[PDB]
Assembly symmetry: D2
Homo-oligomer: 494 residues x 4
C-alpha cells in the first residue's frame, strides 16, 4: 500500500499493480486527421470519454478503493461531489461490492443525482453549497467510519490515473510530447511520474485554464497556494488549490506548463467534434487547446503529440454557448446595415438580389419616414472572399450597405437588439409566419406577401435549416394573428 | 450474386455471406437507462455512429462493391453524394482496393470534400446542384465504365444493411420491436427482411420525418411516388422517392409506420446525448423519436424496444438550433416583463431581490420618463414550481411583473428584439463590460456601477456560464468605450 | 421454454436465445493447411477443445440449466457422468450459481473426480459401475428434488449445442458440408436443425464409430434401438441407444451418415496434431476421420468442408496406443532379419555398414553355434525408397537379409518377443548400458565394447532420441552389472 | 536502432517500440490448477505455443527484421534453420513483405520444409548437416546481400523476446519468480533485462537441460565457451555456445540457474498436458521442470511462480518416448512372474482369479515340461496399495508369484523380450486373434479358447483400450492362421 511520498520506482510498481480493469477499460488513441494536416504534426487523442462514467476518474477511484483494508471496505467509503469524481466513486463501489455514500448540495440538479445513483452510489443531499456538502461528508467519516475518497491528492489515486499513461506508451511508443489538463493535479502527477519511469525523453506538459491556474500559481510560489477566484466554465478543473502530493510530483516530473482562455477551449471542443465526432466537456478539451497554443509558440512541426480527452460530461444545452463563442472567431456570415427606401416592395426587391442564398437575419423597425434600415445576415461558405462578392453585388445593384461583419458590438450584442419601439405610435397588426427553410425561402415568402401592406416591423432569425419563422407588423405558409401580444405591448409597441 | 427481386431465404443467405467486417464493425447495443425509466420500457440503441464513417452506410456499400466482378472492380466504381453514402463508398473502395470516383456539386463545403478524400475516394466537383452532379456521374459511368453504387435501391446494398439486424438479434434475442429510420428504404428493407426470416414475431416499424415521408406516400398509393417537396433538416432521409426494391420489401415485411416532426427529432437528439453521450444527426435520432411517439400512442409498457442510431454526421454549429428548439418545450427559465421606476438605482434594487440566481436576460431601452420596462430572464432548475416562487417573491417585494414564460412570441422572437431606438434622441455614451459569470455576478456588477449614472440602454444575454457581457448606455471589470459604434448608430441611436 | 418435439423455427429461436456465452466462448474455425493440400479441398476444423472444459458439452448443459425455473434452480441439478458431460454440468452450475451434484462410480480415477470438483460440482462416489451411479442419481432426483441434466436427449440441450452451428455459419458462410460426431445425437441434432433453418443447401453428415453406431442402427430400424455392444476406445460416443428427440431431428435433417474404424480415428488424431497442433480425444477426431473417408468415397474436390473437433479430454498415456496404431500404416522404419556369423566382431562389422543411421531395434539371443540372427530396425525418412536402398546396400555388403517391414506379425507381435532363453544353459553375465542418442551412437558403442567378449544376448529398443539403452549378456558409457537379475532368471536364463 | 551493448533503459525503450503485434499476439497466462494444489504455490504458464508458429521465436525475428533499413529489406533476409527460428523468420517476412531465404540441410524432413514454405519463406535445401547449411547461408549473405537473421545473439532479437515479459508483468503484476528456458539465451536475456527495468524485485531463473547447459558452463568460466557435446532430446535448446550479448545480459540480470535431466522434462510435459491440455515440446516444458526442482530445493511455498511454455513443435510420435519415460516413475501397472503348472487350463484358471481387471501383458514361451512361467502385467488405478492387494489375492489363491514391478530391467528391457525360441523344437501351429478390449476380455477369450489345445507360446500386449490382440502357438473372435510366419521362423521357432 502506497503512503506518504513514494519514490518513482514505487509509483511505477503501484501503477502496474492497480487493478483498474475490473472497472475501467483501455481507451482508444486516435489520430486527429484534419488537425494533424492543418498543424503539420501527428496529433493523437486519448479517448477517456469512452470510460463507462465518461471520464478518466474511475481509474484513480477504483485503485484507491481496491487498496483499502477489509475493515475499511466493510465500513464503506464516502466523498463529496456532484460531478465526475462522484460518478467514478459510485461506479467503483458497485464493481468492488462496497457501500459508497456521496454527499451533494441539496440544489444539485436531479439528473446529476440520478446519474450517480444509477452508477451504484447512495446519495445524501446536504448543504447550501459544495463546502457544506464536504463538511458533512467529513463529519460522517468521523462519526460512522467511512473512508474518504479524495478526488486527486492521494498516492493510490495518482497511481490509478497513471494507468492511462501506461496504456498510452504502449499504444504509441514513438510519442514526442503529451499534454495533460490540470485541476488538482492527480491526472498530471500520475501521467508524468509513469512516463518519466518508462520513457523519460517524452515531454509532459500541463495545461491549465488561465482563470483556474492553481498549478501555475503553486509553481510560481514554490508550494501549494489558494487561488482567490476560480472560473466555473471548466468545472472539472475548477480547483482553488493544488494537491500537496500532486504538486510534489508535478514540480519534479513536468517539463512545461501553458495556460489558455475559455474561447480557446471552445475552439478545441469544436475541433474534437469535427475530427473524431467526440463531445468533450470544457475540461476534456483543455489539453488540446494548450497543445495548439504550444505548437504555435514553439514552431513545433513533424512530431507525434498526444492530449487527453479527459471527460465528456457537459450538458447538451451548454454546447450553444460554445458554438456561439466559436462563431465569433469564424467567418460563417456577413452582417450588413442596408439602407433602403420606405416604399412598398423595397424588401422584396432587395431580397431578389440576394437570390438563392441563406439569410440568417432580416430585422427592421420603422424609424425614418424616408429610409428603412435593415440588419441583414447572410450565411457564408467561402468566408471573406464570399463576403466581398456579396458587398460588390449589392453595390453594383445600387444599395447603400455598411459592412458590420467585423463589428464586435454587432456580433456580440446588437444582433440581439434590432427592433424595439417605433419613433411614434402606429396603428399596426402583428402576425407570425412559418415556412420550410431552403435557399431563397425568405425571398419566396416576401414575393408571396407582396406589396399591398406597409411593413413596420420584421424579425427573422435563422440558422439556415428546417423552418423559417417570421414576425411582421403591418400598418393599417402558416400564419397566425399575434396582434396585442403582451410581449409586443411591453417592448415593441409605440 | 443477388439480382432482381430475391426471395426472403435468398436475402438471408446474402446477409450471412456479405463480407462487411472487412470494413464495418459490430457496433454496441446499449440500454438507455434514463429514458427506459421514464417510459417504462427497456429501450436499446444500436450505435451505428461507431462505424469508421460514423454511419451504417459502409455496410451496404461494401457488400455491393465486394460482389462486383473482377472486370467491374478493375474499371472502378462511381457515385454522386456529398454525405454519408459518399463516405461509405470512399471507405469501402479503400478497403477493397478499388478506384472510387465521387461526384459532388461544386459548392460542396470543403470539409465534406476532404472527409471523403480522407476516406480514400477520388472526388470530382461538378454541377450547380445534386441533380447535375448525379447526371455527370451517370454520364461518366456510361463513357468510362464505372459501376454506379446506389445509396439504397439494390439487393446487395439491402443485404449489406441487413447485417446490422443479424447482429441485433444476437445481441438481444428477446427484443419485442425494432424502429428504423427511412430515407430511400435500404436500411428498413434489409432489417425487416432479415428479422422476418429469423424471428418473425419481432415487430419492425418504419419511422419517417413527416415532411420527408416518401415510404408513407408510397404505401398509401401502392407503389413508389414522387414527393413534391422534402424537408432538409434531416439530410440522410431527404429522399423524394422510395426505391423500387426497397418498397417491395418494406410493403411486405414491415409491421407499421409512424411519422414525427422536426421538434420531436430535436428532443430525441437531446435524449441520446443525455443518456449515452452520443451525438446523433437528425436522421440518426429519427427512429428514437418515432419510438417515443409509438410508445405513447399504443400504451406500450414492459417491452424490449430497439432503435437504430443510424449516423452522427451533423455539423457542430447545427446543435445550436436543436438546443434552441428543445428549450421551447422545456422549463429552464422564467421570462418576465418587469416595470420599475426610472429612478437611479432601480435596476440595482430589483437585482438585489433576485439575489444569487443566474440571470439569463436583462434588457432595456429608455421609453417612458416615469417607468422603465425590463425584459428579465432567470435560469430555473425546478421548473414551474420555481417560476411561481420567483413571481411570488417579486410580488411580495412590490414589483409589477407580467409573466412571459409561456408567451410563444416572447420565447421565439421578442427575446431577440428588446432594445431598438429611444422615443427621442438622447445625449448618451455607450460602454461594453465583461465579468466572470457566477450566481449574483450581475448584481455585483450593478452594485459596483452604482447610481451616479442614468442608464438609457442595457443588454445582457447569458447562458449562465463563463463570462457575463453587458452593453450599457448612459445619459450625460473590463470596460471599453463603444460610443458611436456603427451598429449602435444604425439600429439603436435616437 | 422448449418442450416435447419443437418445430424447426422454434429450435432456431431457442438457439438464438440460449445464453451460452455466460459460460462457453466462440471457438476458432481453422483451416487445416496440410490436409487441405493433400486432399484437394478446403478443410476447416471447429475447435471446441478451446472451451474451458475442453469440449462442446458446456453449451447444451448451460442452455438447459439456465432455462430451469427458479424453484428447480433452488433445489439444484444432478447428473451421472465421470466424463465431458460431468465437467460441462459442473462448470455451468458454477457460472449459474446453482448446486450441482455429479454421481460417479466409486472406482473413478481421482484425476477425473478432481477435475469435476475443480469446475465447481459436488461429487458423490457411488456404484460399482456407471449404471449403478445413474440409478443413484435418479433416486436422489426423486427423493431430494434435483433436476436431472441429460447428456443429449433434451430440446434445450440440443438448442445449446446448436449455438456451435450458428457460429460456424457466420465464420464461413460459404461452407459446402459439415461433418459431426454422433454419440447420443445432441450435437448432430442441434447442428443439423440449425443449419437447415439458415442455409439448408449445406450438407450435414453424421460420423459414427463402426463399433458404436447407434444412430446408424436406429436409422436402419426406423426408431431408437439398443446396441448389444459398444466399443470403448471413443468414450464420448460410447452410447448404446440414440436419444428419442435427437433421433427425430437426425432422421429429418441429416443428409448422410458414415462410419469409420478405430485406426482411422487414430490417423485423424495425428492429422489434427500435425496440422493445428491440437490434441483431440478419439471422439473429437471422429468427424475428421469420417470426412476423409467421405471425400474419397465420393471423389469430393474443390469444396469447403468443416468438421467439429468436439473434445480434447484424453489421458496423455493414451497417445502411445494411438501413435503405435498410426505407425502400422506408415513407413517410418525398416524391419530386418539379418543372419550373420557367430564370430566375435560380427555385430560391429554389420553396424559399421549401417553407418550414421538411427537404429530402432537390435535384438538377439544365442541359438545356433554357427549363425546369429538379429532383429534390426532402422528409422526411415524417405519410406520404401529408402528401405530399398538399405536392402541393396546390405546385399552389396554380402549380408543375408530378410525384409520384415511388411510382415504384420513382426510389426504387431514379434518386435516385442525377440530374446527369450538360449538353446542350452550358458555361463554368462548381464550388463546394462546407456549412451547419448545420435546417429551412429550404437555403432560407436559397439566399437568401444570391442571384440574381446562373446555376446549371447542383446536388446536395444530406441525411438531415436535422447539416450540409447542396451541390455547385453556375455559368455565367460554408463554401465551396471545386472547379473542374476530376477527378470532375467525367470524369462531369459537357460 | 539498437547496436552493440545497450544499457538497460535502452533495452526497455526498444521493447516498448518493438512492433511485434504486427505478427505475434498476446498469449494467455494460465494457472496450472492441479500442480498449484500439489506444490502449494500459484503456478502460472505463459502460453507461447499459441503464437501462429507455435513458439515465441516470431517475436525476436519480427522485431529485428522490422528494424532493418529499406535497402536491407529490399535485398531480403536469410537464415539457416529447420526448426522454430526458421518458422519465425518465414512468418515475419510474409507479414513484413520482405523476401526471406531459409537454408536447411538436404535431409530435412519434408514436413519441416513445407511448414516453413507454408509460413511464407523460400527454402533452399543445401548441405549434409546444419553446419554446411549455415555456411551456405552466410556465403549467400556475402554474395547476394541478404541480411542474416540470428536466432538469439542480437539486441533487437533480445528486445523482441522481451515483449513477452512486458505482457507477463501486466498479466500478473504480483509475480514472485519467473523461470525461463535457455538455449542461446535470447529469451532469458530479453525477459531478465525487461523485468529488472520494471519490477526488479521479481527473481528471474534460467533453466537448462543438464546435457545442454552452455549458459551454466559460461557462467562458471566467466565468458562464452563451447560445449563438447549437446543432447538432442530438447532441440530448441541444443546450443553449444551461449551468445555474446545474451551472456552479458544473463550474467548481469539473472538471479539463479538450475539444470534438469530429460526424465524431468518428460514429467513436466505430462504435467502441462494434464493441467492445461497443452502439448509442449521438450524445450517448451524445460522451464516448468526447473521450477518444480527449484520449489523442492528451496522449500518455496505460497508464492506466485511463472514459467514459459516456449514452444509446441514436437512430432506426434515423439510423445511415445515421453510417455514411456513417465511410466517408469509412476505406478500404473503391476509386473509379475507367475509360475503355474503346464497343465491344460492353467492359463484360464489363473486369469479367472484376475477377474475383471485390465491385463497389460500376458507373455509365455514353453521351457520346462512341469512349470510354465508367465510375464503378467496388470493395470493399476490405486498404485502400490492396489499392487499389494493383487499380490495378496494371488497368494491366497495358491500361486507362486514374484513381484517384478520395481525391477528396473523388467520395466526397461525384459517386458520387450519374453518369448524367443523353445528349449527343443516343437510341432506347433501359430494363430493371431483379436477381440474388443474391456475388463475381463482376455479372460473371456481364454474361456472360449478352452482347454483342448496345449499352448506353447502366448503374447498379449495391451494398453487397456480398443482391441486386444493375441499371438498364440499350439502343439499338435477374429482369428488368422499365421503358421510358418517368417518372423516366427527366424526368432521364435525351435
Amino acid at each position: 500500500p502506497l503512503s506518504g511520498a513514494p519514490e518513482g520506482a514505487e509509483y511505477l510498481r503501484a501503477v502496474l499493480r492497480a487493478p483498474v480493469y475490473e472497472a475501467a477499460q483501455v481507451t482508444p488513441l486516435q489520430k486527429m486527421e484534419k488537425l494533424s494536416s492543418r498543424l503539420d504534426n501527428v496529433i493523437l487523442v486519448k479517448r477517456e470519454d469512452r470510460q463507462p462514467v465518461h471520464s478518466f476518474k474511475l481509474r484513480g477511484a477504483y485503485a484507491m478503493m481496491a487498496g483499502l483494508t477489509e475493515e475499511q471496505k466493510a465500513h464503506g467509503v464516502i466523498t463529496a461531489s456532484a460531478g465526475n469524481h462522484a460518478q467514478g466513486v459510485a461506479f467503483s463501489s458497485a464493481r468492488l461490492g462496497v457501500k459508497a455514500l456521496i454527499v451533494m448540495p441539496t440544489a444539485t440538479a436531479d439528473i446529476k443525482v440520478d446519474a450517480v445513483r444509477g452508477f451504484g452510489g447512495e446519495v445524501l443531499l446536504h448543504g447550501a453549497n459544495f463546502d457544506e456538502a464536504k463538511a458533512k461528508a467529513i463529519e460522517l467519516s468521523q462519526q460512522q467510519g467511512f473512508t474518504w475518497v479524495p478526488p486527486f491528492d492521494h498516492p493510490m489515486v495518482i497511481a490509478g490515473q497513471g494507468t492511462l499513461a501506461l496504456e498510452l506508451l504502449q499504444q504509441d511508443a514513438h510519442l514526442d510530447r503529451v499534454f495533460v489538463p490540470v485541476g488538482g493535479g492527480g491526472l498530471a502527477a500520475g501521467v508524468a511520474v509513469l512516463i518519466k519511469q518508462l520513457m523519460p525523453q517524452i515531454k509532459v506538459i500541463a495545461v491549465e485554464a488561465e482563470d483556474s491556474a492553481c498549478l501555475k500559481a503553486a509553481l510560481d510560489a514554490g508550494h501549494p497556494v489558494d487561488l482567490p477566484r476560480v472560473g466555473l466554465f471548466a468545472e472539472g478543473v475548477a480547483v482553488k488549490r493544488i494537491g500537496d502530493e500532486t504538486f510534489r510530483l508535478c514540480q519534479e516530473y513536468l517539463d512545461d506548463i501553458i495556460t489558455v482562455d475559455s474561447d480557446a477551449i471552445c475552439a478545441a471542443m469544436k475541433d474534437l467534434f469535427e475530427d473524431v465526432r467526440a463531445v468533450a466537456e470544457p475540461s476534456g478539451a483543455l489539453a488540446l487547446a494548450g497543445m495548439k497554443k504550444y505548437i504555435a509558440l514553439h514552431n513545433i512541426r513533424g512530431e507525434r503529440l498526444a492530449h487527453i480527452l479527459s471527460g465528456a460530461n457537459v450538458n447538451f444545452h451548454g454546447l450553444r454557448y460554445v458554438s456561439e463563442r466559436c462563431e465569433l472567431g469564424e467567418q460563417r456570415e456577413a452582417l450588413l446595415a442596408v439602407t433602403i427606401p420606405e416604399e412598398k416592395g423595397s424588401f422584396l426587391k432587395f431580397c431578389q438580389l440576394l437570390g438563392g442564398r441563406s439569410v440568417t437575419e432580416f430585422n427592421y423597425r420603422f424609424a425614418d419616414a424616408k429610409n428603412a434600415c435593415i440588419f441583414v445576415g447572410v450565411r457564408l461558405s467561402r468566408g471573406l472572399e464570399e463576403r466581398k462578392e456579396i458587398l460588390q453585388m449589392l453595390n453594383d445593384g445600387g444599395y447603400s450597405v455598411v459592412d458590420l461583419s467585423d463589428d464586435e458590438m454587432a456580433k456580440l450584442h446588437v444582433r440581439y437588439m434590432v427592433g424595439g419601439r417605433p419613433s411614434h405610435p402606429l396603428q399596426e397588426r402583428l402576425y407570425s409566419f412559418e415556412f420550410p427553410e431552403s435557399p431563397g425561402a425568405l425571398l419566396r415568402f416576401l414575393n408571396t406577401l407582396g406589396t399591398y401592406w406597409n411593413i413596420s416591423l420584421f424579425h427573422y432569425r435563422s440558422h439556415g435549416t428546417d423552418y423559417g419563422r417570421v414576425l411582421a407588423a403591418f400598418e393599417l405558409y402558416d400564419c397566425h394573428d399575434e396582434t396585442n401580444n403582451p410581449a409586443f405591448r411591453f417592448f415593441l409597441a409605440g
